UniProtKB/Swiss-Prot annotation:
Gene Ontology process terms (BP): base-excision repair
Family membership: Belongs to the AP endonuclease 2 family.
Reaction(s) this enzyme catalyzes, per UniProt: Endonucleolytic cleavage to 5'-phosphooligonucleotide end-products
Binding annotation for Zn(2+) 3: 181, 226, 228
Comment on bound cofactor: Binds 3 Zn(2+) ions.
Swiss-Prot/TrEMBL cofactor(s): Zn(2+)
Residues given in the record as Zn(2+) 2 binding sites: 144, 178, 213, 258
Entry function: Endonuclease IV plays a role in DNA repair. It cleaves phosphodiester bonds at apurinic or apyrimidinic (AP) sites, generating a 3'-hydroxyl group and a 5'-terminal sugar phosphate.
Annotated GO MF terms: deoxyribonuclease IV (phage-T4-induced) activity; DNA binding; DNA-(apurinic or apyrimidinic site) endonuclease activity; phosphoric diester hydrolase activity; zinc ion binding
Organism placement in taxonomy: Bacteria, Bacillati, Bacillota, Bacilli, Bacillales
Record-given protein name: Probable endonuclease 4
NCBIfam families registered for this protein in UniProt: nfo (TIGR00587), PRK01060.1-1 (NF002196)
Residue spans crossing the bilayer: none
Keywords per UniProt: DNA damage, DNA repair, Endonuclease, Hydrolase, Metal-binding, Nuclease, Zinc
């Protein structure tokens, strides 16, 4: 069972600290940004502390880790060449870092068309990915299913398919399937998940899902809000999320929790991952989970 969460990548320890945190929460995989999620400033590969990080992963049985590109990348921007070029340049270096880290996939929000229209944005994403994928490496770009807020591209499987077919470099592309996003976009992952996968197989191919993000949602299906909720406390519910986590189609695919911290005061927020993972592994919902997280 490859089950983990987002973990921090910071300080002097960097990847070593990430692996320590993942083991602390009982994880067998984890996801990291290579630095701050909201900027493109990045440390050297040497400073990422990869050798020691790998040592800790070997010690604790962690594998199949995932990288997420910063949220501010927008290679769909057709008006500002500098934003497009920064995104392309950054992802080229991110591929190099990820190849050194040993992750197979970088999760990328496809982009936002910011008024040019979805199809102009898709055309620009294709252009950008063709420049990013210079063939020096095996790391894939895993396009994330998006919830559909604002001018985000990727709310539907068809949009992702149009990007993939446009790039025409299929072994360098994959999909990250986020349960909150697909639910918020309108897919019936709560009550007809196998039907959603059948549609996905027709349009993209389920074999191309290489990362799964496991999130409940604060909103009902189709609301397009992208507000994550702890497992079982939102509108998707535990029965559906547990089914997805254990689904045979996602065997050997990392499942990554991105659920919110719990707590009354922002000063006293605590991570829910250790207890959510225990709940998923035991396949039984615990209504006291949020009160227990506040007690750790
Ligand atoms: Cl698995
Ligand atoms: Cl490359
Ligand atoms: Cl719903
Ligand atoms: Fe994401
Ligand atoms: Fe996600
Ligand atoms: Zn989200």
């Amino acid at each position: 069972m490859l089950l983990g969460s987002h973990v921090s990548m910071s300080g002097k320890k960097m990847l070593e600290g990430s692996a320590i945190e993942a083991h602390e929460y009982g994880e067998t995989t984890f996801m990291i940004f290579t630095g701050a999620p909201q900027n493109t400033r990045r440390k050297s590969i040497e400073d990422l502390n990869i050798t020691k990080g790998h040592e800790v992963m070997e010690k604790y049985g962690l594998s199949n880790i995932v990288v997420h590109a910063p949220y501010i990348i927008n290679i769909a921007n057709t008006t500002k060449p500098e934003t497009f070029n920064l995104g392309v340049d950054f992802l080229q270096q991110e591929i190099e870092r990820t190849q050194a880290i040993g992750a197979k996939d970088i999760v990328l929000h496809p982009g936002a068309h910011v008024g040019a229209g979805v199809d102009a944005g898709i055309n620009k994403i294709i252009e950008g990915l063709n420049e990013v994928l210079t063939n020096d490496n095996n790391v894939r770009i895993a396009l994330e299913t998006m919830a559909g807020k604002g001018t985000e591209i990727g709310r539907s499987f068809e949009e992702l398919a149009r990007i993939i077919d446009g790039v025409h470099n299929n072994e360098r592309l994959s999909v990250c399937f986020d349960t909150c996003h697909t639910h918020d976009a309108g897919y019936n992952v709560k009550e007809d998940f196998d039907g959603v996968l059948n549609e996905f197989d027709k349009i993209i191919g389920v074999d191309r899902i290489k990362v799964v993000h496991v999130n409940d949602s604060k909103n009902d299906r189709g609301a397009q809000k992208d507000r994550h909720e702890n497992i079982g406390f939102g509108y998707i519910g535990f029965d559906a999320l547990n089914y997805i986590v254990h689904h045979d189609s996602f065997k050997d695919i990392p499942k990554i929790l991105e659920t919110p911290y719990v707590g009354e005061d922002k000063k006293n927020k605590k991570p829910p991952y250790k207890l959510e993972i225990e709940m998923l592994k035991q396949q039984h919902f615990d209504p006291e989970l949020k009160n227990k997280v506040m007690q750790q």
